[PDB]
Design a protein. Structure first.
Lengths: 107, 67, 49, 204, 49, 218, 49, 49
């Protein structure tokens, strides 16, 4: 969700600045005035180098731990096997996955 | 090497260009009066390379108006 | 909520906390009685309060 | 109606009352189980499916982006069933299957003569630090495998589902005979075969 | 400043009632002074008197 | 006799009779007005219309316009007015205005992609009551607020984040405004995953645990 | 109410945090022994007294 | 900085009196530059000692 918002916002910079400039003076705005002000400045039709760099800056580096290969027993925790014995269902999953990917070379 | 453009310019271009450069520099830097360089280079991450249209200071400047 | 009906109490006035100049004026009168070294930069000692 | 271990329907409404803000489906109270307490294991699995069927059908018809907050309490009920299966010594873990519940049971008197409320305490003294992970993993497997199963069930029987919802929309309340009639004349053949196989048995 | 431009009219009433008691504005019956511990609102009151 | 609190129409009719004497501008929609005041009882609308009337008489006019009705409502829901924001530096007004404008902009943008969010009504940075800035939305009918689908909750989360992310994208630097967003957002996000079960945690969205609220009677 | 901060039981027994107990204990023991040894070394040359 | 003192009231610390501006961040704003600067200033004393 935060990446979605930051993507929405780093396109309508001119509209946001026009809105700030307008609001700082009258200290109040009604919805209609805002809607027309925001319509006056549409987003750019194409992506220039500055716009592309801003959109690349609109990314996050929030680490997501159990993403991809880390969806199985260790879950990307390095120390989990020095603290926990391996559960039973995890052994079962390892067994079925191993038989699947080890009979497929024959299948 | 450095800038080349023409050869050695005349005497009228020198004066009219000095006054023109003064005008453009003033009207360009007008809205950034009274703040530090880090605030500026974080307000204009893409570089201060054209005129600003939305200034909201206490004595606000309009588009292209000089000080 | 009974007294806030019209006629009874229909006006409220908000008195805010002072600012630099207001505090300077306040302490310039608490000096009219006591003894004080006259040349005190009241504005600056009011900026820090 | 298509699960052979659940009682037959008796009436289904969509008219909210003053206390229940959604519809209701009501089943015929089976007196045997209610008087003795013989709730088998088969029946508990099917009751799990029934508890998830509502959300399964909502997602089947109205698309995934339209999941609603009408199935909060049915989700709590499915959780109840799934944990009772684990705490009643019905699990499939070898260290748990026919041997233990989850912890220590303590009963307390309720607001009546014969009513008792159960409590289970689980500490480090009965759960070994890597059976907690198995309890979680298996309850989760039960819940989500049950959801997938009931979803495929409703997928195979789309015609009967739409027929039933049209009739319910137009009559605002129906009885069990209409439901069973519609589903037997519009259901999938294999589900009807299974439903016919277990048709006579009293208790399951 | 805001409540100055406001209490001009309550002072107007306190000077001469029938001047605005019929001029359209309602009867000024009661007002509340809101501020914060230490606002010393009594001060303001005296000025109006 | 049991007299309950008025509904939308009840408040609408109390308003109708209360301004029957007065005159109002033809643009304001008082059905929409009474739709945005759930919880008041009878006399509060009288106080609102009288306050709007005295702001009209101080405005040198007599016709009640949208601005005066909004001023009355704001005074009798938020609180008394307070001195404006300072202007000696760029920071305060810039930051609060950026908050308001970012919220309004992404709201108007989401409304035009799925159509679930409401419409913005009135943006203000006049310190009034306890807050310094405000953004009001147009409430829908009660039929809208009996359910909570998935898309609507996603939009609520995005709207929670918009303010801090707008301040950061305008000012160019992180602030403590984010502090007030993530908190709210995080709460909602938990409710999205555990209680309602909309996510993909496990293959379906059904987790082994969830925290159902308790009544406010406790 | 079980314990959820298991961190290591492969060559020791640790729980989340604790990092700060080996340093503490070795410091305490070292300093106490140094003090006792200085006392012994002084009293060892003054037995007649 | 308004005043720098050593062991005021005989307490075994220093003390520096900082005056700020309330018209810049009106009791509510906190940027990142300010926070990093404060961290550096609070560790300066330990580092100098
Ligand atoms: N404008 C001012 N000029 C001079 N002195 C002032 C001013 N405002 C407040 N004071 C001082 O504030 C002091 C405290 O006033 P006080 O009567 O306690 O107000 P208060 O807000 O009613 N106290 P409290 O009931 O606790 O809120 C007085 O003794 C005054 O000297």
């Amino acid at each position: 969700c935060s990446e979605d918002v930051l993507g929405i916002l780093a396109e309508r910079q001119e509209a946001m600045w026009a809105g700030i400039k307008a609001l700082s003076d009258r200290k109040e705005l009604l919805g209609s005035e805002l809607r027309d002000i925001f319509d006056a400045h549409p987003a750019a039709t194409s992506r220039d180098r500055d716009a592309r760099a801003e959109l690349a800056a609109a990314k996050l580096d929030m680490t997501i731990f159990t993403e991809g290969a880390n969806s199985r027993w260790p879950y990307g925790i390095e120390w989990l096997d020095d603290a926990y014995p391996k559960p039973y269902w995890v052994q079962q999953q390892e067994a079925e996955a191993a038989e699947a990917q080890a009979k497929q070379p024959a299948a | 090497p450095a800038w080349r453009g023409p050869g050695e310019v005349g005497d009228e271009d020198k004066a009219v260009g000095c006054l023109l450069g003064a005008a453009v520099g003033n009207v360009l830097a007008a809205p950034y009066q009274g703040d530090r360089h880090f605030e500026v280079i974080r307000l204009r991450r893409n570089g201060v390379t054209d005129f600003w249209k939305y200034d909201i200071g206490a004595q606000p400047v309009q588009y292209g108006q000089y000080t | 909520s009974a007294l806030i009906r019209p006629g009874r109490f229909d006006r409220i006035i908000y008195m805010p906390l002072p600012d630099a100049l207001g505090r300077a004026k306040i302490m310039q009168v608490h000096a009219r009685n006591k003894a004080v070294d006259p040349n005190i930069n009241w504005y600056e000692v009011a900026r820090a309060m | 109606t298509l699960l052979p271990a659940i009682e037959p329907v008796e009436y289904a409404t969509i008219i909210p009352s003053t206390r229940s803000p959604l519809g209701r489906t009501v089943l015929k109270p089976h007196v045997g189980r209610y008087t003795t307490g013989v709730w088998t294991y088969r029946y508990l699995r099917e009751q799990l499916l029934v508890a998830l069927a509502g959300r399964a059908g909502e997602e089947l018809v109205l698309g995934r982006d339209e999941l609603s907050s009408l199935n909060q309490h049915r989700l709590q009920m499915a959780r109840q069933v799934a944990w009772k299966i684990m705490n009643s010594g019905m699990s499939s873990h070898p260290d748990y299957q026919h041997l233990r519940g989850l912890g220590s049971n303590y009963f307390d008197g309720s607001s009546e003569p014969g009513r008792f409320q159960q409590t289970t305490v689980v500490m480090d003294a009965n759960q070994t630090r890597s059976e907690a992970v198995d309890a979680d993993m298996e309850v989760e497997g039960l819940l989500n495998g049950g959801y997938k199963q009931v979803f495929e069930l409703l997928v195979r029987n789309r015609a009967a589902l739409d027929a039933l919802t049209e009739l319910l929309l137009e009559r605002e309340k129906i009885s069990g005979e209409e439901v069973v009639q519609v589903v037997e004349e519009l259901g999938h053949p294999e589900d009807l075969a299974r439903r016919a196989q277990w048709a006579g048995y009293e208790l399951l | 400043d805001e409540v100055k431009k406001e209490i001009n009219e309550i002072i107007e009433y306190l000077r001469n009632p029938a001047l605005l008691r019929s001029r359209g504005v309602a009867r000024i019956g009661g007002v509340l002074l809101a501020g914060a511990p230490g606002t010393g609102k009594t001060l303001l009151a005296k000025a109006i008197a | 006799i049991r007299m309950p609190k008025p509904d939308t129409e009840g408040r609408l009719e109390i308003l109708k009779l209360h301004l029957r004497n007065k005159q109002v501008a033809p643009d304001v929609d008082l059905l929409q007005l009474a739709r945005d005041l759930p919880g008041l009882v009878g006399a509060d609308l009288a106080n609102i219309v009288n306050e709007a009337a005295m702001t009209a008489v101080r405005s040198g006019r007599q016709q009640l316009t949208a601005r005066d009705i909004y001023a009355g409502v704001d005074r009798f829901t938020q609180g008394e007015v307070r001195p404006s924001l300072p202007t000696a530096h760029k920071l305060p007004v810039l930051c609060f205005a950026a908050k308001e404008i970012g919220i309004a902009l992404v709201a108007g943008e989401l409304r035009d992609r799925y159509g679930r969010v409401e419409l913005v009504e009135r943006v203000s940075i006049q310190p009034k009551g306890r807050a310094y800035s405000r953004t009001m939305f147009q409430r829908g009918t009660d039929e809208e607020y009996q359910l909570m689908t998935r898309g609507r909750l996603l939009d609520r989360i995005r709207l929670a984040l918009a303010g801090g992310f707008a301040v950061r994208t305008a000012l160019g630097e992180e602030t403590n405004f984010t502090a007030a967003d993530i908190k709210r957002a995080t709460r909602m996000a938990k409710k999205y995953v555990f209680y309602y079960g909309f996510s993909e945690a496990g293959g379906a969205g059904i987790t082994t645990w969830a925290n159902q609220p308790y009544s406010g009677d406790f | 109410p079980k314990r959820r901060r298991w961190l290591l039981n492969n060559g020791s027994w640790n729980f989340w945090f604790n990092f700060d107990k080996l340093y503490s204990e070795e410091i305490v023991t070292t300093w106490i022994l140094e003090s006792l040894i200085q006392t012994y070394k002084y009293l060892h040359k003054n037995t007649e007294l | 900085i308004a005043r720098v003192s050593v062991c005021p009231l005989n307490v075994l610390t220093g003390f520096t009196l900082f005056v700020e501006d309330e018209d810049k961040n009106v009791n509510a704003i906190l940027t990142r530059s300010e926070l990093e600067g404060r961290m550096v200033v609070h560790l300066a004393g330990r580092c100098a000692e």
